[PDB]
């Protein structure tokens, strides 16, 4: 094959670790619909692999569907707050907290940094489902699993 200029925008060549793309007799186990070889996996907790993961061309280590990152621990929900960073977003969780002495509630919120794979295109104000993973940066502990 030739070099895809739409993808190779770095000083080092971008490739998937799991498979070898330069194979003369590729195996149908990891053969994509468009001929090429692509590695993808099924994560566990009743979630579906997006079609862009199986049939796309993006290279993303730290993607739960196309890399060695696994999902284990907590599953949470939140609303998208900011999308200014590259391949990572900020989400907000809003909740009510009870005070016993004054039998009443007060509004509180929390913020989390979440890695977003190129399979999704969330916008500010949208709702997402996220899952816990191993530490990926100084602050990132979650990965986007579905966009609603």
């Amino acid at each position: 094959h030739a070099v895809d200029a739409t993808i190779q925008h770095e000083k080092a060549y971008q490739r998937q670790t799991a498979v070898n793309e330069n194979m003369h007799r590729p195996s149908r186990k990891h053969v994509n619909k468009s001929g090429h070889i692509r590695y993808s996996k099924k994560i566990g907790l009743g979630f579906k692999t997006p079609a862009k993961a199986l049939n796309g061309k993006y290279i993303d280590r730290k993607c739960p569907f196309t890399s060695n990152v696994v999902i284990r621990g907590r599953i949470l929900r939140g609303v998208v707050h900011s999308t200014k960073m590259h391949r990572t977003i900020i989400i907000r969780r809003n909740y009510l907290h009870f005070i016993k002495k004054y039998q009443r509630y007060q509004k509180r919120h929390k913020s989390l940094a979440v890695h977003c794979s190129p399979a999704f295109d969330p916008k500010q104000g949208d709702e997402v489902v996220i899952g816990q993973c191993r530490p990926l940066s100084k602050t990132i502990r979650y990965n986007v699993l579905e966009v609603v």
Binding site: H1, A2, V3, E10, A12, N22, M23, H24, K138
Partner: protein, 180 residues
């Protein structure tokens, strides 16, 4: 000594962490190997649990694989040509994982002749082997020139070895243009 803890870092609020404990051995770091090209010289390091890490200081030979043929050979290293971190590493000829090197191509030529009967007993399994098999012009051009490009796949500062794989496909063209 060197530590790997997060205590000295700033908080995301910009505030300063007040440390109320001394440094612990369980969070240490060590000085880098800075492996160079030359006659073999290694140094053992006793790591946690009693196991040993082999710190390579100089290397000049390695085990390199031709992925298409699923074989491997032991060959001599000649030069360091490219490095994505910085070209000051190329100037000093430093060996690290994922750097591009040039290796001797003579052992690979000998294997090709003895396996396919092609120069670049009655039982002719060669005719069977050449059926539905072809070689890339980019590789054969280097095999005739004497040296062939390869990518280091091991971590010399952790295991003491410099192993790798030959460049083929679109990855070969990517680095050829970056060297042109």
């Amino acid at each position: 000594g060197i530590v790997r803890s997060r205590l000295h870092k700033r908080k995301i609020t910009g505030g300063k962490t007040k440390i109320h404990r001394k440094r612990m051995k369980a969070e240490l770091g060590r000085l880098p190997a800075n492996t160079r090209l030359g006659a073999r010289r290694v140094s053992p390091v006793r790591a946690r649990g009693g196991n040993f890490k082999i710190r390579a200081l100089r290397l000049d030979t390695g085990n390199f694989a031709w992925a298409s043929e699923a074989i491997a050979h032991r060959v001599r290293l000649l030069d360091v040509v490219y490095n994505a971190t910085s070209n000051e590493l190329v100037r000093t000829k430093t060996l690290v994982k994922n750097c591009i090197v040039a290796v001797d191509a003579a052992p690979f030529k000998r294997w090709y002749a003895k396996h396919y009967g092609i120069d670049l007993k009655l039982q002719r399994e060669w005719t069977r082997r050449r059926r539905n098999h072809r070689v890339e012009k980019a590789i054969a051009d280097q095999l005739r020139e004497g040296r062939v490009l390869a990518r280091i796949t091991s971590r010399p500062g952790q295991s003491g070895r410099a192993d790798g794989i030959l460049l083929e496909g679109a990855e070969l063209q990517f680095y050829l243009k970056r060297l042109e």
